[PDB]
């Protein structure tokens, strides 16, 4: 039950999920150890049947949904 | 400009995450988080030159056991990190050693064997001199005592291993 997120500057994390968090939840200290601020960023579900085309999320999606999938972090 | 392969190695709990944040993002992260993967990188200036560092922060699981080569393939150079405060945490390096030395098929290896929570010294079970020995033993490898903590020999961890690429 992880979800592998990769992040800006080439970097990526893989974080745990417990039932009931939310995907800003289950990211937030791996955020914040990078200076990430999820207001400045958008999230999106790598979309691999679709040549990888991102599906931006909302940061209070529910993580468990998640499990499996694999998010990029991108600036606005 | 150049980039640098980094990868930091040992048990759980000795701090290779702490120090790898601790000299990328400058702060200090007291609880334990186990990490399963995550990566990290730097711009850094080395003696006085342009360098790029990608470190790699490992897991002590059963997969990053069963990845740990190709870690090690791909990595430039490696910090092998225990903590003064866990026996066994120093006695698990060994095997990584050997194993690098494998991998890349060569005794010259960038590596520096790490010391770390060099603060905590009333907890000490490891002795400085009993770490010199073992860096000793492994060809006269370069050797520290770190504090992610105190911030002591932080960045000469990261700093010597871009030298030893660098030679
Ligand atoms: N006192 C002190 N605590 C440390 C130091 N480095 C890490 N720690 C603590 O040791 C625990 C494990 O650190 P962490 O970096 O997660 O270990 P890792 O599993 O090797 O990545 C954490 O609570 C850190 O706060 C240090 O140099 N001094
Ligand atoms: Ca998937
Ligand atoms: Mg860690």
Redesign the interface.
Known sequence: N?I?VFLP????????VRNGMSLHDCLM??LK???LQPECCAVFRLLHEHKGKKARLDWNTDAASLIGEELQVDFL | MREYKLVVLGSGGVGKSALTVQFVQGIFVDEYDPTIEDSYRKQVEVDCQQCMLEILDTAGTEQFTAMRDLYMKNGQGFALVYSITAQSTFNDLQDLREQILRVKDTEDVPMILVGNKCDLEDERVVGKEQGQNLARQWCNCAFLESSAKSKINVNEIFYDLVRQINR
């Open positions: 992880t592998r500057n080439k970097q990526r994390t893989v974080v745990r200290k791996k150890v990078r200076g």
